[PDB]
Structures are given as structure tokens and as C-alpha cells.
């Protein structure tokens, strides 16, 4: 049985987009789903204190967010894939992504059972 992808991030960005772009690659290994994170808050006591630029610039990483978990339906555990080396921000379309560092990086993952 395939072990399932888990991929978190803002929808409807072209970080998250070209991320799962990628890792549609791999079907043929894994499934994959989506998770949506839909709302951000800056904690209230943040608000109160350079100028507020910075605020909007901590709203505007949100669109940078990306997390991929790996889930083994079978053995019902779960690993948290490294995916940072295969990242390059500085970048604007498909070599955001590194598909043959992100395989290896998702391969090596290593499964636990967390509490």
C-alpha cells in the first residue's frame, strides 16, 4: 500500500503550487493530499510593539509556508520530511524546486510514533 504525502500550505500561492507540482511526480509512489491553512493571526501582543513594515512582511511569509509529512497507513506512523535543502526562495518558477533532492530528502524521512 502507497505511504501518503501530507503537504500544509496557503493555497492558491505559487510556492505551495510548485511544491505540489513536484511531488505530483511522484504518484506513481506516493498519494498525496492537501491541507489548507486558511487563516493568520498575529498574536495580539506582538501588535503592540523599525515600522509596522515588518508586519506586513511577517503576513506576507505566510505565503512561504510549506510543510510535507509522510503518513504509513499500515504501520500508522509518521515521519517529517527535511525539505529545506531542496528549496530556493530567491527563485521564480521550476528550479524552486529541486525534485531529485526533495525524493531523497521525502526517502530518508525517518518514521515515529509521536505522542
Given at each position: 500500500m502507497?505511504?501518503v ?7 492558491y ?8 507540482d513536484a ?5 506513481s ?7 489548507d491553512?486558511l ?9 503592540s510593539?523599525?515600522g ?34 531542496s528549496?530556493?526562495?530567491?527563485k ?16 530518508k524521512?525517518?518514521?515515529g510514533?509521536?505522542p
Amino acid at each position: 500500500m502507497k505511504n501518503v504525502l501530507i503537504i500544509f500550505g496557503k493555497p492558491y500561492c505559487s510556492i505551495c503550487e510548485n511544491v505540489s507540482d513536484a511531488v505530483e511526480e511522484l504518484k506513481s509512489e506516493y498519494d498525496i493530499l492537501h491541507v489548507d491553512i486558511l487563516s493568520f493571526f498575529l498574536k495580539d501582543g506582538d501588535s503592540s510593539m523599525r515600522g509596522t513594515l515588518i508586519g506586513n512582511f511577517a503576513a506576507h511569509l505566510s505565503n512561504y509556508i510549506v510543510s510535507i509529512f509522510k503518513y504509513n497507513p499500515q504501520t500508522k506512523q509518521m515521519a517529517f520530511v527535511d525539505i529545506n535543502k531542496s528549496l530556493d526562495f530567491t527563485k521564480t518558477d521550476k528550479s524552486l524546486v529541486n525534485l531529485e533532492i526533495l525524493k531523497s530528502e521525502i526517502e530518508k524521512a525517518t518514521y515515529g510514533v509521536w505522542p
